[PDB]
Design a protein around this ligand. Structure first.
Ligand SMILES: COc1cc(-c2cccc(-c3ccc4c(c3)OCCO4)c2Cl)ccc1CNCCNS(C)(=O)=O
Lengths: 114, 116
């Protein structure tokens, strides 16, 4: 099992939305076996465990601002959507995916002002 | 839900001593090696990649060849214990143990080495 980032650097305009993608291999999807986790500066962004997001562990600064696009998991794409990106959202994100095997990658986000 | 725990997230060790750094994880009955992944890392360097019962030495960073062990007799007790023989200063740093056994979780451990 291997997780891939076709793009490991993203340049997003401030105040944009951003969707950063980690690809993992896809038969039909076994939601009960899949765990997708995203993180940045060791803050819990997304904890997608067997079927859905657990928001009791998501960090304050990401409540109602971060989303894993559920309709894209079927395509073997863990896609993290951060709305209204701020300068602080620049940094190094980590998708960790558990789905049979287990792997992780790094994506770097740089945020321009206008 | 599934959580990895770390009784000690700071290890102060002597130059050239041995160190064993632990991440505990829950186990009910018999340990099911096929369901279990344990991975250890420091500074983006692969140390241990114990997946489905067998260590992978192809992926293991050269600086840990012959130097690093995942203690299999501890796994059964829900304890993932990375053993590093003859620690040098190059071993100080932040270690992550990432564990997949049913759920998934990871923890950090900081390793400080006093000098020779
Ligand atoms: C289930 O939540 C996580 C899930 C993973 C996760 C997700 C996907 C893959 C992996 C993983 C595991 C082993 C690996 C690996 C990746 O890549 C390399 C090979 O070894 C891992 Cl760790 C990490 C952190 C978390 C945060 N848990 C907060 C805890 N407390 S609570 C109250 O929420 O329960």
């Amino acid at each position: 099992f291997t997780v891939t980032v076709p793009k490991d650097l993203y340049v997003v305009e401030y105040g944009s939305n951003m969707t950063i993608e980690c690809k993992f291999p896809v038969k039909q999807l076994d939601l009960a076996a899949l765990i997708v986790y995203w993180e940045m500066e060791d803050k819990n962004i997304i904890q997608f465990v067997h079927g859905e997001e657990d928001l009791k562990v998501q960090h304050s600064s990401y409540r109602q601002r971060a989303r894993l696009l559920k309709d894209q998991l079927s395509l073997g794409n863990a896609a993290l959507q951060i709305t209204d990106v701020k300068l602080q959202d620049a940094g190094v994100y980590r998708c960790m995916i558990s789905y049979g095997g287990a792997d992780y990658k790094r994506i770097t986000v740089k945020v321009n002002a206008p």
